[PDB]
Amino acid sequence: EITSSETGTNNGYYYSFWTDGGGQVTYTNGPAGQYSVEWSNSGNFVAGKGWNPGSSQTITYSGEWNPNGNSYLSVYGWTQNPLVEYYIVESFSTYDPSTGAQELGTVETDDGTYKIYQTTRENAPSIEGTATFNQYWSVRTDHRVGGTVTTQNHFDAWKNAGLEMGTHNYMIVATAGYQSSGSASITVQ
Ligand SMILES: [Zn+2]
């Protein structure tokens, strides 16, 4: 359906499709909370459906995620003032996003354990344009596709660990890839 970056609202869900234009990345909206993405020798992309703005709602999602190479399935979003990109990583394939970060703790929620990390990005694409911003990570120890994410438990754990959150911008269930191929079909319930 679309092959270049776009945001909108479809069947009552915010959607964000971002690609740096590398290889081929194809996104489609489905009924209700559903989206599909297919990608071949991609650059960096992030795609999904959810809310704008995010509250700190309990997310339920279903579907399938079939990467061949580097990909993450995550609750993904932004805060503003301060500018923060955050990830609650449910699965990653061939590359752990927290590589080269101090573990700041763990949080137990939704029948799993998540390792907490903070990174910085310098002169990087953001919802505000080229910027410097912190990235917060919750990375599940037992990878899964589907289930419940109690986002407030992650936000509270990050704040407990001294990681400041801003005003919530969007929050989506995202499929991310980098220099990989794959497909995914995800429904936000
Ligand atoms: Zn995995």
Ligand SMILES: [Zn+2]
């Ligand atoms: Zn398992």
